[PDB]
């Protein structure tokens, strides 16, 4: 699905355009990062507006996987490109509004502030 | 690689102990007196009381 050193889109108003993976979190050698799993990442190129520019590193939550995973019910979610959402340390986001739909699986880990500020959910 | 000490005649004999060919089973045709193969036709043709080939 999502592997080490992966560039994906930015789906929130943080100023960045491309996000690159730094390392998957959890235990060592996880080798993958699925929906809802937090991952340390960095920015690649950003517009002058925004609270973050080139050079800094953050922790983000993956919200879009192209391969997709099968839910416990039987509905296997799919997406075309890959997106992510940025936070600072806490569950609160670093951006006001989020572009694009977000999966329901975040409810299994919290992040209700992210879903409450979305335009469409699964 | 190759052998480092020569193989004795005993070694080759024990190796070829399995060389003996099996005794192939035979069968007697029901109309042409001969010892043919098994499940197979003889030189005449009647694999059973039924033919297939002309003469050979």
């Amino acid at each position: 699905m999502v592997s080490f050193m992966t560039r994906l889109n930015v789906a929130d108003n943080t100023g960045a355009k491309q996000v690159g993976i730094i390392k998957v979190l959890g235990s060592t050698r996880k080798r993958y990062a699925f929906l809802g799993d937090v991952v340390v990442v960095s920015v690649k190129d950003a517009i002058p507006s925004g609270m973050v520019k080139k050079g800094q590193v953050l922790r983000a939550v993956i919200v879009r996987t192209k391969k997709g995973q099968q839910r416990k019910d039987g509905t296997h979610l799919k997406f075309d490109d890959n997106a992510c959402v940025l936070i600072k340390e806490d569950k609160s986001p670093r951006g006001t509004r989020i572009f694009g739909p977000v999966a329901r699986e975040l409810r299994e880990r919290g992040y209700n502030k992210i879903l409450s500020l979305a335009v469409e959910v699964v | 690689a190759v052998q480092q000490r020569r193989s004795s005649k005993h070694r080759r004999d024990k190796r070829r102990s399995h060389d003996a060919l099996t005794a192939q089973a035979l069968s007697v045709c029901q109309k042409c007196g001969k010892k043919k193969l098994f499940h197979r036709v003889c030189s005449c043709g009647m694999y059973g009381d039924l033919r297939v080939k002309k003469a050979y």
Binding site: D73, G74, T75, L77, F79, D80, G100, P101, R104 | -
Partner: protein, 115 residues
């Protein structure tokens, strides 16, 4: 004795439905899905286009594509699944039982509706 290999269908009769509409690749469809996260079941509507329909007697499944904010969404549904309902609103002309071209084209390429 012996086995029939049709017992797969024989036992599967416990979970089945005979009210599923017919649709292959282009008919405009809608799915109503029920979610259970509170005391009240939440109802979500999902309109869009068909991608594939496949199954033998229980593996009958389909794929629905929609668009939102210029981003496409593919969702896979099991036909025989509680609290999932399907309906057809506008069927259309198709040339293949399975399509895969929508993964790179969106908009200005809608399926022409047949007679």
């Amino acid at each position: 004795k012996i086995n029939k290999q049709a017992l797969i269908d024989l036992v599967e009769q416990k979970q089945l439905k005979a009210y599923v509409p017919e649709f292959s690749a282009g008919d405009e469809v809608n799915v109503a899905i029920k979610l259970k996260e509170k005391e009240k079941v939440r109802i979500q509507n999902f309109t869009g286009t068909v991608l594939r329909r496949r199954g033998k007697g229980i593996s009958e499944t389909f794929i629905v594509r929609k668009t939102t904010d210029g981003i496409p969404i593919e969702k896979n549904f099991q036909i025989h699944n509680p609290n999932i309902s399907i309906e057809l609103k506008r069927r259309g002309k198709v040339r293949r039982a399975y399509i895969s071209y929508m993964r790179e084209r969106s908009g200005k390429a809608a399926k022409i509706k047949e007679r």
